[PDB]
Enzyme design. Structure first.
Site, mmCIF file in Angstrom:
data_model
loop_
_atom_site.group_PDB
_atom_site.id
_atom_site.type_symbol
_atom_site.label_atom_id
_atom_site.label_comp_id
_atom_site.label_asym_id
_atom_site.label_seq_id
_atom_site.Cartn_x
_atom_site.Cartn_y
_atom_site.Cartn_z
ATOM 1 N N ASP A 142 -34.738 31.521 -26.405
ATOM 2 C CA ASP A 142 -33.934 31.464 -27.614
ATOM 3 C C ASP A 142 -32.502 31.917 -27.433
ATOM 4 O OD1 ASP A 142 -33.218 30.899 -30.263
ATOM 5 O OD2 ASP A 142 -34.424 32.617 -31.118
ATOM 6 N N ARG A 146 -25.546 32.557 -31.651
ATOM 7 C CA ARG A 146 -26.036 33.312 -32.789
ATOM 8 C C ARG A 146 -26.823 34.564 -32.366
ATOM 9 N NH1 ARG A 146 -29.538 28.996 -33.516
ATOM 10 N NH2 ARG A 146 -30.851 29.527 -31.694
ATOM 11 N N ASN A 147 -27.433 34.506 -31.181
ATOM 12 C CA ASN A 147 -28.253 35.583 -30.637
ATOM 13 C C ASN A 147 -27.530 36.357 -29.575
ATOM 14 O OD1 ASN A 147 -31.225 33.625 -31.119
ATOM 15 N ND2 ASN A 147 -30.758 35.622 -32.104
ATOM 16 N N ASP A 160 -32.664 39.256 -29.652
ATOM 17 C CA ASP A 160 -33.682 38.393 -30.247
ATOM 18 C C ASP A 160 -34.688 37.877 -29.219
ATOM 19 O OD1 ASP A 160 -33.519 35.865 -32.808
ATOM 20 O OD2 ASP A 160 -35.218 36.468 -31.505
#
Length: 299
Positions: A142, A146-147, A160
């Protein structure tokens, strides 16, 4: 025939931390903000809290404890660490909250102030971090802008580990069985076969870099996910960011190759970018370039 882990898993009371505002919610549960106030200690510590949906799902309750295990064992300057865990009915995770939100949200703001020496450094860091994970036999599954938390514009960290997965002494890949996934960030192989490897993460890294070079643009904008696979099999990729020299874009292109063994490795991604970071101007065209409370790190 390995080394003992010795990683500490601290348990927190639902009374040691409060929730200020919600940051995200999905089929997993919700991620709030709030601050933590250790037992006795008179110091408030801003953190992120991830709580589940229901305490009755042997599946989620197991994955949650898994995520805890991995985020509690990682020890790298560019990887977020778990602060604690609250074994309340709906298990809650307490991790570090960078004071500058995610790298994605960062670039969409300071886009008119972001230089090259910076962008290249972030590339280096993320790779450094991911390489560290590859060593632990971990698969983020992932990675995305954004992470990536921002501790400081000169220092970013990955987080994350929702989807994250560990590998078996001999296992070289991981087969997944259903559950929401960010299509526009995953290797073609992980779509046609739901297979995830370290080289698959490399792909995501590519996409992540693109985001940064584009200053937060959205990949495959509009173009719904229910076709990407077909687009990709058609040799189509994300375009070359105007600010990017062929030298850089190439690294990206190599990331999105069909043959996973033909994509770069995080080990070398670090050298490649490291080099460039010494002469950013010769790799990025960004006109104007030259132009009570604690942190979380207090053992």
């Amino acid at each position: 025939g390995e080394a003992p882990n010795q990683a500490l898993l601290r348990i927190l009371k639902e009374t040691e931390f409060k929730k200020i505002k919600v940051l995200g919610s999905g089929a997993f549960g919700t991620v709030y903000k709030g601050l933590w106030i250790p037992e006795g200690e008179k110091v408030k510590i801003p953190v992120a809290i991830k709580e589940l949906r229901e305490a009755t799902s042997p599946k989620a309750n197991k994955e949650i404890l898994d995520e805890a295990y991995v985020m509690a064992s990682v020890d790298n300057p560019h990887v977020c660490r778990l602060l604690g865990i609250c074994l309340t009915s709906t298990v809650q995770l307490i991790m570090q909250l960078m004071p500058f939100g995610c790298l994605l949200d960062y670039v969409r703001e300071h886009k008119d102030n972001i230089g090259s020496q910076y962008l290249l450094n972030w590339c280096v860091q993320i790779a450094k971090g991911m390489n560290y994970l590859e060593d632990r036999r971990l698969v983020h599954r992932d990675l995305a802008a954004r992470n990536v938390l921002v501790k400081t514009p000169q220092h970013v960290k990955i987080t994350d580990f929702g989807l994250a997965k560990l590998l078996g002494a001999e296992e070289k890949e991981y087969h997944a069985e259903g559950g929401k996934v960010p299509i526009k960030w995953m290797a073609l192989e992980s779509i046609l076969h739901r297979i995830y490897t370290h080289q698959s993460d490399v792909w995501s890294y590519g996409v992540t870099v693109w985001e940064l070079m584009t200053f937060g643009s959205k990949p495959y904008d509009g173009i719904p996910a229910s076709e990407i696979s077909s687009i990709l099999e058609k040799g189509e990729r994300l375009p070359q960011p105007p600010i990017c020299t062929i030298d850089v874009y190439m690294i990206m292109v190599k990331c999105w190759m069909i043959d996973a063994d033909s994509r770069p490795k995080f080990r070398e991604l670090i050298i490649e970018f490291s080099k460039m970071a010494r002469d950013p101007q010769r790799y990025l065209v960004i006109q104007g370039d030259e132009r009570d409370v604690v942190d979380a790190d207090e053992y």
